């Protein structure tokens with residue numbers, strides 16, 4: 516599923532975009548677009564539109580999970596245990612309208628927003644390495660999800 520070159524390209528793009536923000540300006544610009552393009556997930560996340568600061572709260576807190584998961588892409592025995600739990604958490608949120616169908620799509624559109632921080636440094640290996648790592652990150656959260 517992943518390779519040493521990709522695992523390295525993943526930890527190399529997370530130390531820059533998530534330097535001190537840990538991915539704060541990554542989900543706020545991604546979730547915001549998802550909420551706008553999708554008016555069915557806004558009430559689910561807890562926002563009224565794309566002009567809501569809450570978006571920067573979820574897209575940010577969520578990015579962190581991807582960070583703790585970036586320190587173990589080849590080791591899917593523990594970093595996947597925490598993500599699997601997040602799914603169980605989404606099984607009873609304040610909206611009870613979560614779905615893994617928005618994950619993939621919201622995951623791909625997320626890599627296009629990461630370039631906003633490392634614009635110019637995000638090469639193909641950066642979006643590809645993360646495009647292969649985010650698959651195991653989110654895919655590992657859909658397990659406990661819909662519980």
Ligand code: HEM
Pocket residue numbers: 556559560561573576577578580581601604605608609610612613614615617618621652653656
């Ligand atoms: C696109 C599908 C998703 C939906 C609809 C969704 C929805 C939500 C909602 C509604 C909350 C709580 C906000 C509130 O108070 O209402 C939340 C929290 C959170 N979500 Fe998601 N989420 C999705 C995908 C993800 C993914 C893929 C990750 C992981 C990368 C993730 C990680 C988190 C984290 C870490 C929190 C913080 C809450 C906690 O864990 O205690 N979410 N999500």
